[PDB]
């Protein structure tokens, strides 16, 4: 009794935290034009899936818990929404990971590559494939034949009426081989790899800017204290090459022009005059080049900042979801093994609970959601 | 071992669905892309289209599956019967919204934009669907023949839930269909809409009549003429040109009137010639633009009315059939009359897109653009 009330209460509480948060996430993206980006469009899809868990999956579980025995088909139908919705989440996250990859990987062609319509197609695909994976049990892959044998062996007519249990209607072979090994693990590992790559790229790109910045300062010391024009030329050419790398506009025009005006001397062989260019290059550097460096730093570090937040979401997803899979694997491979009910129950509470986390982590980590949620709260949900 | 009649039913259903789904998807497409259709009326036409897409994509397939399929549990047949009830109810309320929107424009044109706002239109839409789900899901809450079938199942002497040939009249209560759905949730909306449109026409025809009255008053027409011209003027980027056309006119009417106090006709003819120049210079624009904008209000109203007429004409037979089955269970009614009634209702989901294309100019131009830009296969036309 009190345990059932506790289950129902915890479920109700998880649902009560889940639904408003994700509705608020979906709200936040619609109102705010600063969140009109591919990443956020997938966060809306991911939020929608979480709203569906709290609004549909958790109520069904409670209704099945408090309810009577059901037909096989009834229990089979009720088992699928969570399979669809959980699958949608994974693909939605994978979309976010590849979107995060593409930005840093192909920044010049990003806007022409990743377009709203393509993002929409990608979204639609996730849901289509999610319905495909989640409805597979409805097509036939289940224990119907296994239960019909026991129903006839017991000697009962018509469709099997049973206590609605997941393991009674959904095939563990399906859950382990099809769902987990094909449709969970490879996306997870691929995403885990993609993020490592995303960090690797950003850290290297940050390193390259500091490399170019230090190269440009280091060679000014070489030019200012050089004996032979050959030393100055070797500095100037590397400074130029560094400037052409750093450019990948008009500050760089003015700089590279002054490097050419310096270089022009080095062909004749006059060091004295080359010091006059060096003083101007320092003026150009401080006039123009600091801006590019600082803005590149800030915009790269902003790419880094989000990546961590989006990674944390993946970590939380994986950490929330892996237990219930491990449980499905150990039940399949070791049916002889006993596994305590509390471990089963906390695993299930973690999965439903995962629908509450995203809105909370967005509020804590992502600045633009924080400012919006406050505005929505103040303007609409304030006492 | 399938009957040619069954094949014909399935084929006609499939064809109706094949005409219905693309048309309404194209209607929903047309409103989204075109900013000229970003108006309250069209926002209800999207909701009405969505309902029709659902008939062709969900209701017609379910009917075919039930037709070709086996006997079902009572609950299965009860569940499958409801979507059409929801969707049909949505249509009526969506049309009623359109009727009152058409009324409000002509009734309160000055305050229309401040009254009928996007959010209010959205709330109104949402309401239609909520109430539609309420009316349509009522049978799922309990109002059905379950107890009536359970008696016969036990009387036959069979255990468990009733398995039966899935028929509408076997699971849905006729009392519900006649008293609740038809008498409360169909007829009053229909009659109210029928009244609203008559009023909408009445207003527009009178407003058109008044402009021609003022125009004819001005052209027929010293004091008795001038006072009527004045009275007509008081009744009567661009607003500046109208304002100033009226300044130039009323100024010349004052310059004419100035003579009438003294009493000199000869000179007043000099003003009359200038007033005709002012009329043809400025006043024709106001008249013609008012004519065009009023006649555009008239043009849509007829199209939207035709949709109501077609809806009522498509839907009333199946209701009459439900009433006569309820009140006269002894009465025999031929199957063809039952079948054409049912074909009409599913068919109604195909009509709206077709009538929009024929009558409404802005949908016609859009459907062509969507066809050309997305669904064109010109190399087949070149291939011929
Ligand atoms: S209690 O023991 O009475 C009890 C009451 C209610 C519930 C419950 O809410 N169950 C819903 C979760 C069912 N379920 C799944 O939905 N999935 C799919 C996830 C996408 C599973 O993979 C799953 N595995 C299991 C168990 C776990 C270990 C024991 C055998 C399978 N349940 C799953 C539960 C208990
Ligand atoms: S044939 O006789 O085998 C046959 C095959 C298939 C169908 C069929 O597709 N029927 C679907 C229509 C069911 N139906 C409704 O949906 N509604 C609700 C409208 C919003 C009705 O009101 C309704 N009334 C009836 C009949 C009418 C005459 C006999 C009594 C009930 N069916 C309705 C049909 C036949
Ligand atoms: C018993 C199952 C019933 C199935 C009904 C299927 C239809 C589902 C309803 C969806 C709501 C559609 C809302 C459309 C609003 C359009 C708003 C707009 O014009 O922008
Ligand atoms: C939210 C409001 C209540 C949540 C707790 C409800 C628990 C009911 C327990 C009764 C039972 O055992 O079925
Ligand atoms: C067996 C029945 C399964 C029912 C599953 C429930 C799913 C309901 C929730 C969402 C489905 C529609 C997907 C819409 C995605 C829109 C995301 C976006 O706005 O980008
Ligand atoms: C056998 C497999 C069954 C497949 C059923 C199809 C399910 C499709 C569900 C939802 C499609 C719409 C998703 C929303 C796409 C729009 C994305 C956007 O523009 O934001
Ligand atoms: C669109 C097609 C509509 C109707 C097709 C009807 C085909 C009838 C062939 C029946 C053959 C038979 O079963 O004997
Ligand atoms: C027009 C009407 C011709 C189609 C008549 C359909 C009868 C179907 C009979 C059946 O399905 O058994
Ligand atoms: C009978 C009790 C159950 C009631 C359930 C009602 C389900 C409501 C479903 C959809 C309503 C939301 C429609 C959104 C309309 C959007 C309008 C707009 O913004 O254009």
From Swiss-Prot, chain B:
Residues 1-7, 67-77, 144-173, 328-335 are extracellular. The keyword Transmembrane helix applies. GO terms for cellular component: asymmetric synapse; axolemma; basolateral plasma membrane; calyx of Held; cilium; dendrite; dendritic spine; neuronal cell body. It is a multi-pass membrane protein. Gene3D superfamilies: Rhodopsin 7-helix transmembrane proteins. Residues 31-43, 100-120 are cytoplasmic. Glycans are attached at residue 156. A lipid is attached at residue 377 (S-palmitoyl cysteine). Signal peptide: none annotated. The chain crosses the membrane at residues 8-30, 44-66, 78-99, 121-143, 174-198, 304-327, 336-360. GO terms for molecular function: G protein-coupled adenosine receptor activity; G protein-coupled receptor binding; G-protein beta/gamma-subunit complex binding; heat shock protein binding; heterotrimeric G-protein binding; protein heterodimerization activity; purine nucleoside binding. It is found in: Cell membrane. Its main location: membrane. Keywords: Cell membrane, Disulfide bond, G-protein coupled receptor, Glycoprotein, Lipoprotein, Membrane, Palmitate, Receptor, Transducer, Transmembrane, Transmembrane helix. One of its GO terms (biological process) is negative regulation of systemic arterial blood pressure. Disulfide bonds join 77-166. Pfam families: 7tm_1 (PF00001). Belongs to the G-protein coupled receptor 1 family. Receptor for adenosine. The activity of this receptor is mediated by G proteins which inhibit adenylyl cyclase. This is Adenosine receptor A1. It comes from Homo sapiens (Human). The gene is ADORA1.
